[PDB]
Design a protein around this ligand. Sequence first.
Ligand code: F6C
Ligand code: F6C
Ligand code: CLA
Ligand code: CLA
Ligand code: CLA
Ligand SMILES: CC1=C(/C=C/C(C)=C/C=C/C(C)=C/C=C/C=C(C)/C=C/C=C(C)/C=C/C2=C(C)CCCC2(C)C)C(C)(C)CCC1
Ligand SMILES: CC1=C(/C=C/C(C)=C/C=C/C(C)=C/C=C/C=C(C)/C=C/C=C(C)/C=C/C2=C(C)CCCC2(C)C)C(C)(C)CCC1
Ligand SMILES: CC1=C(C/C=C(\C)CCC[C@H](C)CCC[C@H](C)CCCC(C)C)C(=O)c2ccccc2C1=O
Ligand SMILES: [Ca+2]
Ligand SMILES: [Ca+2]
Lengths: 172, 122, 42, 80, 739, 31, 75
Amino acid sequence: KLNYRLDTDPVQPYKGDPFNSNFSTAITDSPLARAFINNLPAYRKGLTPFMRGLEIGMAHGYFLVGPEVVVGPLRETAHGANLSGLITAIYIAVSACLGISIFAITTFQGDPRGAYGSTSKDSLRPLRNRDEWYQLNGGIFLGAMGGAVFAYLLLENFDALDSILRGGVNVN
Amino acid sequence: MRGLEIGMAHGYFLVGPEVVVGPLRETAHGANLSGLITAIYIAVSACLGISIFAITTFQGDPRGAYGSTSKDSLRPLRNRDEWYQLNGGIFLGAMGGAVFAYLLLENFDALDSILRGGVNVN
Amino acid sequence: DMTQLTGSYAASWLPWIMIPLIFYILPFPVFALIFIWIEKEA
Amino acid sequence: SHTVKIYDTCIGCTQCVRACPTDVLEMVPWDGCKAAQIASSPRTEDCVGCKRCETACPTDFLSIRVYLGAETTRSMGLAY
Amino acid sequence: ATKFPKFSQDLAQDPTTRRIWYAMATAHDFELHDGMTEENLYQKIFASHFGHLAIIFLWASGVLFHVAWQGNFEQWIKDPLNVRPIAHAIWDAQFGPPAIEAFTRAGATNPVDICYSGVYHWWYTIGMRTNNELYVGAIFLLLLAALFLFAGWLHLQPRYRPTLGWFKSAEPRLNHHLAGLFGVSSLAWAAHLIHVAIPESRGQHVGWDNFLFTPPHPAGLGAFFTGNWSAYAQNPDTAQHVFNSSQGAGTAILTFLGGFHPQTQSLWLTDMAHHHVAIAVLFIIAGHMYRTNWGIGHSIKEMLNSKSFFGAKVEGPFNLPHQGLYDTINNSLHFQLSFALAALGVASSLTAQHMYSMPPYAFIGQDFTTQAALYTHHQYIAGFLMVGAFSHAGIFWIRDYDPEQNKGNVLDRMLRHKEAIISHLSWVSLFLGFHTLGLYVHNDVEVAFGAAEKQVLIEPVFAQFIQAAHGKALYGFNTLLSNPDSIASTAWPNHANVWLPGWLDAVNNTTNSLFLTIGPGDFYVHHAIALGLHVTTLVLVKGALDARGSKLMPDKKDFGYAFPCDGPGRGGTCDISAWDASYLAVFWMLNTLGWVTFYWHWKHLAIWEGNIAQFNESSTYLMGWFRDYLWLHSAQLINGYNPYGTNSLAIWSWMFLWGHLAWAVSFMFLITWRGYWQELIETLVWAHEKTPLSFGYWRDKPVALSIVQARLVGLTHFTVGYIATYGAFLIASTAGKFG
Amino acid sequence: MNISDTQVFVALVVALLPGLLAFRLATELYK
Amino acid sequence: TVPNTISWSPQVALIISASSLLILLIASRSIKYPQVGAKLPVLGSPSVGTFVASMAFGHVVGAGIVLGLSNLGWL
Ligand code: F6C
Ligand code: F6C
Ligand code: CLA
Ligand code: CLA
Ligand code: CLA
Ligand SMILES: CC1=C(/C=C/C(C)=C/C=C/C(C)=C/C=C/C=C(C)/C=C/C=C(C)/C=C/C2=C(C)CCCC2(C)C)C(C)(C)CCC1
Ligand SMILES: CC1=C(/C=C/C(C)=C/C=C/C(C)=C/C=C/C=C(C)/C=C/C=C(C)/C=C/C2=C(C)CCCC2(C)C)C(C)(C)CCC1
Ligand SMILES: CC1=C(C/C=C(\C)CCC[C@H](C)CCC[C@H](C)CCCC(C)C)C(=O)c2ccccc2C1=O
Ligand SMILES: [Ca+2]
Ligand SMILES: [Ca+2]
């Protein structure tokens, strides 16, 4: 008389284990969600740790420039606003890279505690070696600095780039 | 390091064509910006191509010259990790060389005074 | 003035951003996606 | 690989075997014709599909038929 | 092996680049997919059809949205005859200031394209007035496309996947598609015309906010139920009516005036409303013919298998064996596709032939470039649809036809006298080609030698007689509708020719395209068209009927529809498959449609110029076509840009060249064949393998394109160049000399 | 008087629904 | 403006009687539990509860129809 009806359940246990504190939902287990998340540079199969950090840094440093350019305290002038946005991205990225460095220093002592231990099976945290974290951090810093400068250069040359994208450079 | 040197050289020389014969050549600032942007676009496209080459080539035993039994001496990067490190070096070196050329061209008046000794007037 | 691309229609910046995106920004990533799709080992 | 089929109208003239540039065919004992032999295709993996065997076949219609199928490295005749 | 393609292990194991190409060429050939069953085939086709409908709706929504966003619909309403409709804005960041100025026109302050699809006139006729209405229509079409996409997804879920019997039930599908899809849709369109379009054309706004309490006719629905239908035909629009205004506007919703509205020079809105009402009634009636669930109704299988004509023993309908055909069509998707494509091609041809002569949209007959574009578009689409109909006829012959279940029926008889059919088609083609070309070049020689009076100039007397019988009194004939005393014109028993006055007024009007005057040049070009039609039919029919085999290849059916050849033996067998026949027939279809559109365009150009004599005197010899049509009208097209500047035709000037480029490229794929390129590719492979610093290496071995792939690619380039070149020429030569 | 910024943005948002449904239908057909 | 309402006439009686009758045919053959309670031809022999329900709903639907039509000049 007891019918759990698990065989027709739209939401299944995660990876077939009902006692892993997770569900098989559209966010966690749908084919598009898995394809998108697992192919982000953090999880993409085969990527070297430095290459992971390079792509993550490029993306994050590029957009971190924006907020202070538009609503920052130097927004009244174009030249000042761009500089403040670039410095804000540099300060945040350097602070984050310092945090990543001291995370690697403290986590990887003997057998690491928690999710980075030898016996841990956390699929969402695959960087299990100290060397991988330092290679990732080097990529993060260089990518973030490059992406921030790339946004800074485009914004600094916005007058030229606006004419570029409208064909105003074709007058002469 | 291989990628770094190759990127340095290629990004450095890729800026010039659009600077000299590009559509923004009428003004120095726009020409330099267009050359730098062209170098960046070409290098990023090449790096994306290298990434997808590494992704598709190294599955199981790679086909062709990158297989385990291949003896191609002209293609010595037989590992996926080597290709990804090469790509990172290529991107960073190409961006650095393009920016170096852009900075040299943007300050061409100052650098021309430098190389003629005109900075020694005062 | 007729020295630049302009738009009197609403949100004339939309072509300004979308033409580059569709025609020479996103197409290479799309080609990369398709190339990865068509080269995957069984 | 391509598919090579030999039908019962074969007269055992051995011309298809002689014309094959990759040795797909051979002559095997048979009793359906006066020559007491018939063509066989044990090595269709090596068949490139040139259809020289069909050109060599004198019967009407052909006693040997080549049906082009899945293309492999050796079926496309690739040296690389 | 690779995962891609998912539907073919044979391709997935291919180690060359061919694997990719064929994967795109066989993706939609569901029947050849690995492990495909009939039920899965039908369900996948159903979902694909849902997707295609969604794509069509998205395309219509995009057209509407771009007109509402960047067009000039409201400005064009106030002066349809002098304002250029705007397709969409131009954003090309590599334009120069001269190009920006040249393309900034039609009242816009930014570069724009000029719409030539006629959607402005169509939306104007059906009562749309504001950009907000177009925007609402675009949003609604977006939602409709979303609905159809969801339906396609849903009918693939396990509970909602239809069974094979549901797909095979022909009679209910015919009933619903006749009565509902054709009939009810026509009734709803007539309702839209009566409730919305006609009041809007009479200066009265009817929308969703007020259509519920705004009756379309003063008599109301009471006149319909009491049998007083004539009240709907009382007080029509006066001949002095001004469109989109109440001046001279009547109250009738269903007239049968005939002819054209005097100002818009297009069909009366009330006439089209009554047309769609009658069509809806007829199709709803036709949708009750077959039996589904209540006993009453015909059974198509019984009709085809019947052998008794009221007791007398007949072999079938018209004493012809039609037995076993119900299973033949019902089990062959290619047979049904062949009928559908042929019907759509005939419908597109009729659309082209009937919209230019009887314009249905206000002022569209005075937009010359739009008229030419629409006619050429629908004629070329009709030609492609006919080619597809015969291609899938051949595919049916190979894949779905078996002689056992069709033993002795009419299809088997056609297959048995295919030789006579093909030989007589060849004779007709030879006669037409020989005599038409001979007369053309005889006129060429006579005109070249200063003896234009010595031309053979055969009058098209039969078509002139038909035009006179339709009411054209120009030729002096006094037969049927051109004779007011004829029993046809009077309709003696009933005198119910309420259409005849307006129809005759439209026919004898010299400013429209209703039964254009025709002379010897029209005779010769119609015979050229007949030659082209017969040769294209010969190619397609010979391919379809020989698809199962011939003397050269008796066992062709065992090789499939599309294969390169059967080798150089037995003399050589290049282009022997039925696919190759369709490939060859695409060339002849393009040539025939080129002749048709050349004729239409030159005649209408002469009419619009005011120089009908040029066409009348020059179309009888081919040098006239070469000089006065192509060379004479190419000047403005080729001067779109020159060393002295650029104008708005520059795009066409570029595209005109672009087509000539693509066409030229096709020759390379059509003249040079595979082995040459395979050897060249082998040399390039060696070069790549022996070059240092070239770390790249192919994952798929580079090979030359296959023989069939080469024919397809060459045909695609040929067709694309053909279409682009002729479209650029048409648009530049019509728009460059007119609005 | 053509449509406004708000109408264009609303159309862009609305077009997301057919886009997601088209992706769903394509992935279902790929099965 | 106030929506138009018409004086009593045989047409409004026809609409209410028809709406009650159509509901009676449908309800006696479509609802989950008819023939419950005390019993009252072509009908499915509805109970007193089902019949009163159909007449009450016939007044509800009928009043909505006549008010809606009179509002719009007969729709
Ligand atoms: C991948 C990689 C690779 C490499 C490396 O690694 C290479 C290299 C080589 C060398 C060795 C030489 C010299 C160079 C030149 O000058 O030319 C070219 C140019 C170019 C530009 C090429 C290109 C290069 C690369 C590709 C780059 C890339 C980059 C990009 C940008 C990417 C992008 C990506 C995205 C996504 C799109 C060559 C060549 C040849 N090719 Mg060859 N490649 C290849 C690729 C390819 C493909 C795909 C194909 C098809 C199309 C071909 C083709 C060809 C032909 C036809 C020929 C000839 O003729 C030549 C010769 O032999 O001489 C003698 N090939 N090449
Ligand atoms: C098209 C083509 C074309 C074009 C166009 O037309 C061009 C242009 C152009 C122009 C812009 C310039 C100059 C400018 C004048 O005059 O003024 C300034 C100067 C200066 C500033 C100079 C100063 C001095 C310096 C700094 C020194 C140098 C350093 C080094 C690099 C180191 C070395 C290390 C080791 C030993 C190697 C240039 C240059 C060039 N290049 Mg060209 N390019 C082309 C090509 C090429 C190719 C292929 C190749 C090879 C690779 C090339 C290389 C090179 C090199 C190395 C170079 C240098 O140095 C420079 C520069 O960038 O710079 C900054 N292109 N360029
Ligand atoms: C099939 C319909 C269709 C087509 C052919 C076009 C065509 C065009 N649009 Mg467009 N558009 C459409 C619908 C369409 N539109 C709809 C419904 C919207 C509202 C969301 C827009 C909103 C829009 C904007 C905001 C802009 C354009 C622009 C343009 C031009 C450049 C292309 C571009 O940037 O796309 C941009 C496309 C979008 C922002 C969304 C398009 C959404 C449609 C429905 C996708 C259709 C997919 C298609 C049916 C599937 C193809 C299948 C494949 C096998 C062919 C070009 C003329 C640009 C322009 O005017 O340049 C001058 C521009 O800036 N469009
Ligand atoms: C509703 C109409 C309709 C439908 C449902 C089909 C359906 C089918 N046809 Mg068919 N056909 C049609 C119209 C139609 N056709 C017309 C009008 C023609 C005449 C031109 C043909 C000519 C034709 C031939 C000659 C063959 C088929 C074949 C097929 C089958 C496999 C399709 C295939 O090869 O994969 C999908 C194929 C492609 C996607 C081809 C690539 C596109 C081509 C090269 C056009 C070039 C694209 C152009 C530049 C731009 C177009 C727009 C762009 C968005 C693509 C399939 C059952 C084949 C078959 O059954 O094999 C035995 C076959 O050999 N058909
Ligand atoms: C200008 C180009 C051209 C011409 C004139 C022809 C002519 C012909 N084609 Mg053709 N074709 C062409 C291009 C052309 N094709 C192309 C590009 C393709 C795509 C590959 C095809 C594909 C094709 C197919 C698939 C078929 C044809 C067929 C035909 C014939 C049918 C018409 C006919 O009998 O008229 C009468 C004949 C002619 C008009 C030919 C010219 C006759 C000359 C002028 C007589 C002169 C005699 C004189 C003494 C010669 C001087 C001496 C000289 C020998 C030195 C005809 C021979 C069909 C056929 O053979 O059916 C019978 C057929 O099935 N063609
Ligand atoms: C999820 C999703 C999404 C989202 C997305 C995103 C979020 C994006 C972002 C993006 C981004 C945010 C991006 C970025 C990028 C970046 C880049 C691309 C960069 C580059 C850079 C460079 C190239 C640099 C360079 C350099 C160096 C390195 C050094 C020297 C200097 C220079 C500058 C040269 C959406 C909603 C849409 C849809 C749905 C889904
Ligand atoms: C073979 C030979 C030759 C040739 C040569 C060549 C070809 C050369 C070239 C050269 C080149 C072409 C070079 C280049 C170089 C480069 C460099 C040297 C660069 C540098 C860079 C840098 C240093 C950068 C930096 C950076 C970064 C990294 C980041 C941040 C920013 C910056 C900018 C700072 C000849 C004929 C003469 C003779 C015979 C032999
Ligand atoms: C040029 C040519 C080649 C060589 C051409 C080859 C090998 C194809 C080269 C294509 C390159 C690599 C890419 C070109 C891509 C197109 C411009 C666009 C393709 C678009 C789809 C991928 C969507 C043949 O192999 C061949 C074979 C048989 C008869 C005639 C010919 C022939 O004429
Ligand atoms: Ca310039
Ligand atoms: Ca100094």
